[PDB]
RNA sequence: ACGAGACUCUGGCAUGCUAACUAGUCUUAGAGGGACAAGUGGCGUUCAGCCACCCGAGAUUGAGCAAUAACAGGUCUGUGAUGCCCUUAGAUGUCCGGGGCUGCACGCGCGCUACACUGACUGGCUCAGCGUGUGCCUACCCUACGCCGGCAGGCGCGGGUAACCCGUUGUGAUGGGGAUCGGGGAUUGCAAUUAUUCCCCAUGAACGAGGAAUUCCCAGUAAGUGCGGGUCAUAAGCUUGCGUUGAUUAAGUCCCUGCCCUUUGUACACACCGCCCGU
């Protein structure tokens, strides 16, 4: 139970710029497509256990999960583990990266804004698209 | 073979006096090998007082709306680290056990006056049971605040619980707050 | 400040603008047995025992 | 506001902190975690390695407080 | 039975009652008095079950005692 | 003589009883028993009674019903229950039909909601519902395997007039509880968006007890939860019930609001939201 790895005070995965304060391997919120049941399924399929020491965990596991996410369609694995599915402009699940870019694409509002629809301006004002009631409850969204 | 628990025994712990058993009373059916005797302590007054001291300390910590009364928590806590410290000590915890709390205890509290006025409180006492248990409740709050937003957690303060439990000297914190209020109220005697 | 063990003889009742203090009467056991009165907070059962840690605390009545 | 503690495994520094725990009166992972201010899981791994050396025996398992003891 | 307080402590009531009946029937009654006195003098809850049960939801309120908030 | 009590229903109890091929006398429901302040202490013209304690399943144990006179309280929009003053043909009959009210600078009133090894998954040991369910109407009832992406389920497939079927229904913003919002096959309801319809990517929201004024509550209280009926298309966010988890505080007082078994004052009696005086 002794590892020859050294403690690293500089570690970089996906070219983000965030503070390293708490532990790792489930504070991966900065990493957008790895974690929870999909990562657990991949890890259990990789046949690795929890025998070693916690806290000092490197990024080989997350890199392997990302790499297996690169080409998931070949193995016929159930493809309901990706963010934007059945989207316009591509019938296949294409890869993207970088911070400050996923958030924009989480709301593809360009086409609905173009068609002069009420749902575009429902989304735009930050108000309720499905119609959450907001007159006595539901005042959050701007605080 | 009438030994209490599996490691103590009642044939030798004597005070040769039959009036100082207000805190430890193991001579009849009320003795428990494990405090999980179930039951209610709010059906009628003086029945919360007729709780054994041990069970009151272990239960009374139930507060907030999420751990409210779930006796599994109390029994698991009192079993855990107790099973460990009994074998890992070898010696007697009796000294600290007794000598922090069960005479840390205050000796008076305060009550309202006249028909108006919330600027001072007249000093009264109680028969030591109610005062000691109010101190115990504030010590439960103190153990929370030593766990709640802090480092030392719940189900690892068995030394402190044994301290809160046993018999007769003074080292506490919430009880010295109670003693400061003691003096403040006693400034009217 | 002697710890004196006294027996409760009669419990009066509650006092306060809403009721916050309880009156009892206690007789000493080995101090030339006589009866005094004192106020007290919290449960104090029928004919229980009080500890007069001080022999001078008197509660005003009404 | 987590503290910075030397966790580096070195030729020299490593074999100075693995021989300081048994020099205290009350030695348990919870006590060391409240006093020496290092994760209790490190103490858990330490006593597990002590078990691996064959000088103690396991009794029960728990994610917070483990039970390894001796009877000799 | 589901519920620890239910099936547990039912096991102890069961062992005590079966043992008491067996001793009463098969050997004598004085020995039965001695052993049953010992067992039910260890604790009382053996022969008594809790009579508390959920009471009916009452009138014009979410629960048996709570009431819908009254507006002035 | 009413009212109160008694009384009915309701839960609580048998090393007892009347018996079931769906449980093996545990479940169901009995002509019945059991508590009565009964036993013992302490307070009580030692009365009515109060407190305590063994014993006991249970020792001020849920609700229902509930006195004349009442009030111009509500109901003629529940009623070929009701006396006729009295409009309009835009009959306040019909016909999957047609704007709203699903606005957000809020004018108000019920409502939707828990702070960390307690909150939440490893799915690694037998769980409860109280109850509902298909033709005088009537055409609408509750539901178990396969096409399989990951299950209700687009079509067949049987059971149930029901105890038989549904159904034994590491020191605090991190991993921890979700701020709008998008994909998978959608339960088949013309329209749902101008209220019917699943969880997964962790995209980050004052992320740890709250203006004046505050409503409800004393033990299986409150509160957290889900579940079943009424409404009905399995339409609930409402209501009426039901269980599961479950208890910190008080066994008090008349201070606020209000009530009652008294005396007292009155110039009030439409009764103090009165009466009434003054250029």
PDB file of C-alpha atoms in Angstrom, chain B residues 76 80-85 87-89 151-152 155-157, chain D residues 26-28 30-31 33-35 37 60 62 65-67 69:
ATOM      1  CA  UNK B  76     -25.454   2.597  17.443  1.00  0.00           C
ATOM      2  CA  UNK B  80     -19.657   2.108  18.700  1.00  0.00           C
ATOM      3  CA  UNK B  81     -16.295   3.212  20.125  1.00  0.00           C
ATOM      4  CA  UNK B  82     -17.647   1.885  23.414  1.00  0.00           C
ATOM      5  CA  UNK B  83     -16.842  -1.630  22.227  1.00  0.00           C
ATOM      6  CA  UNK B  84     -13.428  -0.242  21.241  1.00  0.00           C
ATOM      7  CA  UNK B  85     -12.469   1.896  24.243  1.00  0.00           C
ATOM      8  CA  UNK B  87     -10.643  -3.089  25.364  1.00  0.00           C
ATOM      9  CA  UNK B  88      -8.218  -0.322  24.377  1.00  0.00           C
ATOM     10  CA  UNK B  89      -8.221   1.360  27.808  1.00  0.00           C
ATOM     11  CA  UNK B 151     -13.995  18.926  13.777  1.00  0.00           C
ATOM     12  CA  UNK B 152     -14.822  16.392  16.517  1.00  0.00           C
ATOM     13  CA  UNK B 155     -20.223   8.874  17.738  1.00  0.00           C
ATOM     14  CA  UNK B 156     -16.609   9.555  18.703  1.00  0.00           C
ATOM     15  CA  UNK B 157     -17.108  11.530  21.960  1.00  0.00           C
TER      16      UNK B 157
ATOM     17  CA  UNK D  26      -4.717   7.952  23.501  1.00  0.00           C
ATOM     18  CA  UNK D  27      -3.893   6.703  20.001  1.00  0.00           C
ATOM     19  CA  UNK D  28      -6.930   6.262  17.735  1.00  0.00           C
ATOM     20  CA  UNK D  30     -10.415   9.833  15.534  1.00  0.00           C
ATOM     21  CA  UNK D  31      -8.088  11.261  18.190  1.00  0.00           C
ATOM     22  CA  UNK D  33      -7.639  13.309  13.267  1.00  0.00           C
ATOM     23  CA  UNK D  34      -8.781  15.834  15.871  1.00  0.00           C
ATOM     24  CA  UNK D  35      -5.293  16.439  17.325  1.00  0.00           C
ATOM     25  CA  UNK D  37      -4.954  17.338  11.985  1.00  0.00           C
ATOM     26  CA  UNK D  60     -14.970  -5.636  12.486  1.00  0.00           C
ATOM     27  CA  UNK D  62     -16.658   0.297   9.516  1.00  0.00           C
ATOM     28  CA  UNK D  65     -14.060   3.547  13.121  1.00  0.00           C
ATOM     29  CA  UNK D  66     -12.299   0.238  12.405  1.00  0.00           C
ATOM     30  CA  UNK D  67     -11.533  -2.451  14.997  1.00  0.00           C
ATOM     31  CA  UNK D  69      -6.753  -5.223  18.362  1.00  0.00           C
TER      32      UNK D  69
END
